Ligand binder design. Sequence first.
Ligand SMILES: Cc1cc2nc3c(=O)[nH]c(=O)nc-3n(C[C@H](O)[C@H](O)[C@H](O)COP(=O)(O)O)c2cc1C
Ligand SMILES: Cc1cc2nc3c(=O)[nH]c(=O)nc-3n(C[C@H](O)[C@H](O)[C@H](O)COP(=O)(O)O)c2cc1C
Lengths: 105, 105
Amino acid sequence: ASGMIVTDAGADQPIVFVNRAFSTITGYAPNEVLGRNARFLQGPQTDAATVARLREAIAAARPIQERILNYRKDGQPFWNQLSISPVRDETGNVVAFVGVKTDVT
Amino acid sequence: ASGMIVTDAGADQPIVFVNRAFSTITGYAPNEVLGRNARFLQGPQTDAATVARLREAIAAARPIQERILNYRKDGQPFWNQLSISPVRDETGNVVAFVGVKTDVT
Ligand SMILES: Cc1cc2nc3c(=O)[nH]c(=O)nc-3n(C[C@H](O)[C@H](O)[C@H](O)COP(=O)(O)O)c2cc1C
Ligand SMILES: Cc1cc2nc3c(=O)[nH]c(=O)nc-3n(C[C@H](O)[C@H](O)[C@H](O)COP(=O)(O)O)c2cc1C
């Protein structure tokens, strides 16, 4: 199943919701991740240039897709086919961001 | 501020997350709405044709906006400038729905 992360729009995009698939994929329970920026999923061999593109896209509230190396709670690396999009109200205000890890199987 | 509702994609789209603004707007706490379809927000003067358009859009995972009459927990009517969109993974599979109540001032 596809993992989903929802964050606040502002400050440092703290996580406000993760679906059940997120916990299966990453080994983290909601209470371990809520209120944190999702960058804790990154680790030593995560590609800096990819992280920079995510940083610029989120700052601009621009949708982005990247294949990024992430790490489970237990330290095991996994490839995250990650897509991030802003949630806008009808005035164009950004209310949240939504991140999806596409189950590519 | 703008309210946000996140639901599962399948079965009867049970609510899995509401933002702080949702509780301020509707008078419902998260524990009062989690696992329920959002239709409990409707009441006697809600326009049936508006509800039917939402029903068809969600069934087909099509984005839709409607101005729908909803009811706070205390029964006060309020105009909900509602926008709903599917959350898709990169295969096109629907992972969730997101609903926004636009704060129009
Ligand atoms: C909704 C959302 C979901 C995200 N999910 C992930 C993720 O699953 N894995 C990841 O490495 N980064 C994810 N990020 C990105 C990080 O939170 C952060 O934006 C990125 O590392 C770039 O910014 P930084 O250079 O400040 O860390 C997500 C961001 C947002 C807004
Ligand atoms: C994510 C999401 C948010 C929704 N938010 C609202 C809402 O705020 N107010 C409302 O009247 N209906 C809302 N709905 C619509 C109802 O859940 C339902 O789809 C609608 O009443 C039409 O279907 P029905 O005829 O089966 O009730 C939402 C639906 C989804 C999927």
